[PDB]
Design an enzyme around this catalytic site. Sequence first.
Site, PDB file in Angstrom:
ATOM      1  N   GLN A 167      43.531  31.933  44.184  1.00  0.00           N
ATOM      2  CA  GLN A 167      44.149  33.220  44.444  1.00  0.00           C
ATOM      3  C   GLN A 167      45.579  32.958  44.911  1.00  0.00           C
ATOM      4  O   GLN A 167      45.784  32.257  45.897  1.00  0.00           O
ATOM      5  CB  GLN A 167      43.386  33.962  45.546  1.00  0.00           C
ATOM      6  CG  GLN A 167      43.961  35.335  45.863  1.00  0.00           C
ATOM      7  CD  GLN A 167      43.361  35.943  47.114  1.00  0.00           C
ATOM      8  OE1 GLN A 167      43.496  35.399  48.212  1.00  0.00           O
ATOM      9  NE2 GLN A 167      42.695  37.080  46.956  1.00  0.00           N
TER      10      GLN A 167
ATOM     11  N   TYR B  59      48.550  43.272  51.962  1.00  0.00           N
ATOM     12  CA  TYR B  59      49.621  42.309  51.776  1.00  0.00           C
ATOM     13  C   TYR B  59      50.684  42.910  50.858  1.00  0.00           C
ATOM     14  O   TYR B  59      50.635  44.105  50.570  1.00  0.00           O
ATOM     15  CB  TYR B  59      49.047  40.990  51.250  1.00  0.00           C
ATOM     16  CG  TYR B  59      48.101  40.364  52.261  1.00  0.00           C
ATOM     17  CD1 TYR B  59      48.507  40.160  53.579  1.00  0.00           C
ATOM     18  CD2 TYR B  59      46.793  40.019  51.916  1.00  0.00           C
ATOM     19  CE1 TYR B  59      47.639  39.632  54.534  1.00  0.00           C
ATOM     20  CE2 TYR B  59      45.912  39.487  52.870  1.00  0.00           C
ATOM     21  CZ  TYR B  59      46.346  39.299  54.176  1.00  0.00           C
ATOM     22  OH  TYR B  59      45.495  38.788  55.133  1.00  0.00           O
TER      23      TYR B  59
ATOM     24  N   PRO C 163      37.941  33.854  47.575  1.00  0.00           N
ATOM     25  CA  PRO C 163      38.938  33.098  48.334  1.00  0.00           C
ATOM     26  C   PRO C 163      38.723  33.281  49.827  1.00  0.00           C
ATOM     27  O   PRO C 163      38.501  34.398  50.296  1.00  0.00           O
ATOM     28  CB  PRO C 163      40.262  33.699  47.860  1.00  0.00           C
ATOM     29  CG  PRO C 163      39.886  35.102  47.468  1.00  0.00           C
ATOM     30  CD  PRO C 163      38.582  34.886  46.741  1.00  0.00           C
TER      31      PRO C 163
ATOM     32  N   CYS D 242      40.605  31.861  53.304  1.00  0.00           N
ATOM     33  CA  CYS D 242      41.608  31.098  54.039  1.00  0.00           C
ATOM     34  C   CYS D 242      40.966  30.163  55.051  1.00  0.00           C
ATOM     35  O   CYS D 242      40.008  30.532  55.739  1.00  0.00           O
ATOM     36  CB  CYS D 242      42.560  32.036  54.780  1.00  0.00           C
ATOM     37  SG  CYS D 242      43.822  32.807  53.752  1.00  0.00           S
TER      38      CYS D 242
ATOM     39  N   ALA E 127      43.750  32.246  49.543  1.00  0.00           N
ATOM     40  CA  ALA E 127      45.075  32.804  49.298  1.00  0.00           C
ATOM     41  C   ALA E 127      46.116  31.706  49.475  1.00  0.00           C
ATOM     42  O   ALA E 127      46.285  31.163  50.570  1.00  0.00           O
ATOM     43  CB  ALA E 127      45.355  33.944  50.268  1.00  0.00           C
TER      44      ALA E 127
ATOM     45  N   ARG F  23      42.767  40.897  42.762  1.00  0.00           N
ATOM     46  CA  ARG F  23      41.954  41.565  43.769  1.00  0.00           C
ATOM     47  C   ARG F  23      42.814  42.759  44.174  1.00  0.00           C
ATOM     48  O   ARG F  23      44.031  42.638  44.309  1.00  0.00           O
ATOM     49  CB  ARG F  23      41.656  40.660  44.973  1.00  0.00           C
ATOM     50  CG  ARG F  23      40.252  40.912  45.523  1.00  0.00           C
ATOM     51  CD  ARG F  23      40.222  41.124  47.004  1.00  0.00           C
ATOM     52  NE  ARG F  23      39.833  39.918  47.724  1.00  0.00           N
ATOM     53  CZ  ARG F  23      38.584  39.562  48.029  1.00  0.00           C
ATOM     54  NH1 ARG F  23      37.537  40.301  47.686  1.00  0.00           N
ATOM     55  NH2 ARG F  23      38.388  38.464  48.731  1.00  0.00           N
TER      56      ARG F  23
ATOM     57  N   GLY G 168      30.865  35.155  50.511  1.00  0.00           N
ATOM     58  CA  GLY G 168      31.799  34.411  51.332  1.00  0.00           C
ATOM     59  C   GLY G 168      31.277  33.669  52.543  1.00  0.00           C
ATOM     60  O   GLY G 168      31.007  32.469  52.472  1.00  0.00           O
ATOM     61  N   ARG G 169      31.136  34.380  53.656  1.00  0.00           N
ATOM     62  CA  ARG G 169      30.683  33.758  54.895  1.00  0.00           C
ATOM     63  C   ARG G 169      29.382  32.968  54.813  1.00  0.00           C
ATOM     64  O   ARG G 169      29.230  31.966  55.511  1.00  0.00           O
ATOM     65  CB  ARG G 169      30.619  34.813  56.006  1.00  0.00           C
ATOM     66  CG  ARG G 169      32.009  35.185  56.518  1.00  0.00           C
ATOM     67  CD  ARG G 169      31.999  36.417  57.398  1.00  0.00           C
ATOM     68  NE  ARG G 169      31.629  37.604  56.637  1.00  0.00           N
ATOM     69  CZ  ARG G 169      31.549  38.824  57.155  1.00  0.00           C
ATOM     70  NH1 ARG G 169      31.815  39.018  58.439  1.00  0.00           N
ATOM     71  NH2 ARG G 169      31.196  39.848  56.389  1.00  0.00           N
TER      72      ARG G 169
END
Lengths: 358, 358
Positions: B97, B181, B21, B23, B55, B229, B323-324
């Site tokens: 997610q 979180y 995931p 954002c 997310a 996660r 990811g990136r």
Amino acid sequence: ALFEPYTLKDVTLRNRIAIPPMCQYMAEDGMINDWHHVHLAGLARGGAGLLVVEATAVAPEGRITPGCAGIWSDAHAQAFVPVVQAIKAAGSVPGIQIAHAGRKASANRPWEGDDHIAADDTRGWETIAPSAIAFGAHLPKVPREMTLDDIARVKQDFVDAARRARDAGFEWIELHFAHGYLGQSFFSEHSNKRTDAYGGSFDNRSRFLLETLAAVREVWPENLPLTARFGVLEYDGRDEQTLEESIELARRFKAGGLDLLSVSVGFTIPDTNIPWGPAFMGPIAERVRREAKLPVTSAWGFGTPQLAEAALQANQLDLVSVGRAHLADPHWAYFAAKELGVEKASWTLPAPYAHWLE
Amino acid sequence: ALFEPYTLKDVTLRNRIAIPPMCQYMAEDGMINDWHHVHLAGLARGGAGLLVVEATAVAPEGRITPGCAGIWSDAHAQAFVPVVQAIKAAGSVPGIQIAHAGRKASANRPWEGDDHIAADDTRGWETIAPSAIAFGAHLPKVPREMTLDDIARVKQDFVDAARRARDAGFEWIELHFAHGYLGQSFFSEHSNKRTDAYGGSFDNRSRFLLETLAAVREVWPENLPLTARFGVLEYDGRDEQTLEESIELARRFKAGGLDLLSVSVGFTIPDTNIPWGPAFMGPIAERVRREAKLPVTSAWGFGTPQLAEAALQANQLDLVSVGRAHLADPHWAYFAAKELGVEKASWTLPAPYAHWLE
Ligand SMILES: Cc1cc2nc3c(=O)[nH]c(=O)nc-3n(C[C@H](O)[C@H](O)[C@H](O)COP(=O)(O)O)c2cc1C
Ligand SMILES: Cc1cc2nc3c(=O)[nH]c(=O)nc-3n(C[C@H](O)[C@H](O)[C@H](O)COP(=O)(O)O)c2cc1C
């Protein structure tokens, strides 16, 4: 140089990277769909200054294959609106290539034979061309010789297509007069054996192309780039003579309002010997640019950033067209920015990506 | 190994590449739009076996920022339907997610300050957490201590979110119990100072997470992967004790129906010393996988194909999260296939691309 802006008429490209038209063969009955929307919007967000939509047929029989996009009706044109708007939202200039496959029409998708569709296949259709002569090889179908009314109708189809492109929001148009399709076949003595006003002499062979350009110019905004792709040589053993005539036609195009010419190879007949190589078109495009004093772009092998940069710095081209590298990586512009050491290269991309890659 | 299929419950991924995931901060009032549609559909066509949507807040105050996606209403969920369908059409498994930012909520977008929103900014809102203690640093806002009713409501928000994800078509769900979180903050003694049933002991600190998982399990299909996660260590000088407790919770998750655990760092507090490095999470993920006998995935630096391959071959992970590298190149899977010498690597992509890159 690759990342310097470029202004043509009232349009300004954020850089010199152009994504040339690339058929996707994913349309149905000429209607584009979410394949095209995501494909094009994704490419626009990649950073390129100009995105030219794939060859879009001005008439049903002008499609290359059953999967080709079309714009022969207002419904077809309206399907492009959301895509055009997404391309603009991404900051890229939306362009479109309108075309007619001529004798190379009614063929299978490249990964489904790439040859003329069988006679008893319900998807096929009769092809039209300047003269009833076949390309040969994998495209053996003999096309129907066009009547003067067929020519009048096809010209009007191009006008309708340009008018539709305009109203759909496109800010750049390219007439497909290359790669052995209809326009190219009218110019070439290999395929054009007509004895009327549209064949024989240089003036007659150029007539269809010039009249179509003039007709389109009446509906296409004067403040938006009016361009065309044209094969200037065939590598058929008649290159000097062919290039000379092609350059003369380029001069007529410029006088007729053409703002930029996409220089390519003719592909009019199969018996040729093309010297494929990285940026092999560079020298030819440069000569056309110089002798016709007209802006140009070309393609083939410019996916190597340094080559694109070199071509621009040497003034061989005004815009560099990068095709397949964009299919491999839609964010090629970002890769190029890094390769050439551009400051804040990650910001070639939108913030949601750029922030994390800097 | 990277291109071997993976079956979990009734779902089969075409390869071991998972897009974690990420954002985008492009939603408005929680509603996703064409940014997300093109972004996600483009990634799905890139070749990855699994694509986990960013997310998505289970409640408005659970968003990290004003640009976060949400699924706190049926209208929000319905917005995901066309995206889910496009991801499936591309052959990738659609996952999502669901989350709640807790005390880290009401913050600016990363490129717009990345800090807690000012008190007089009309976009901000009060944050909630297990205890009224601030993260500190760039997130100084002291959150409101949750009442038992707040806890009951948030659990129901997760249930509603999972039910909505199910009906939207998602085939894989991930509960966001990491990165400091809400979920992560209930487990950590740094942020949880409650003296009721949801704080103090290991059993009490685990309660919110376990009850939420159990509640979600009632509405989430048993034949679809149920994952989460979770930050298993903080690099706060208490790693051995923290990892031991985290592994025990992982065992409880497995017994409670969790099919796979995405292993990460806690990020519960700012005063830490994380040893960033390529695939630095590998050893930790492997230990969790081994001691809890639960499938796992992890991330950070796996954009280097050989590292992803090595991690899988050594059985440190079951899926590799990249990811990136996918923000830089949505067709990373194709790049990876080439790098690892996979046969017919271009066909990791759809025919319209693959045919020309082979
Ligand atoms: C899939 C695919 C579709 C193409 N479609 C078109 C088209 O519709 N019109 C056109 O003029 N050229 C078309 N071309 C030729 C490209 O525009 C470009 O000139 C060619 O790929 C050479 O550049 P490259 O080496 O950067 O790929 C296509 C090429 C590929 C690979
Ligand atoms: C833009 C961006 C958005 C992210 N969003 C989320 C998220 O919503 N949920 C989550 O658990 N991790 C999130 N992460 C952390 C990533 O999932 C991933 O674990 C991290 O980027 C490390 O992997 P990488 O080195 O391959 O990029 C995000 C990272 C970036 C760069």
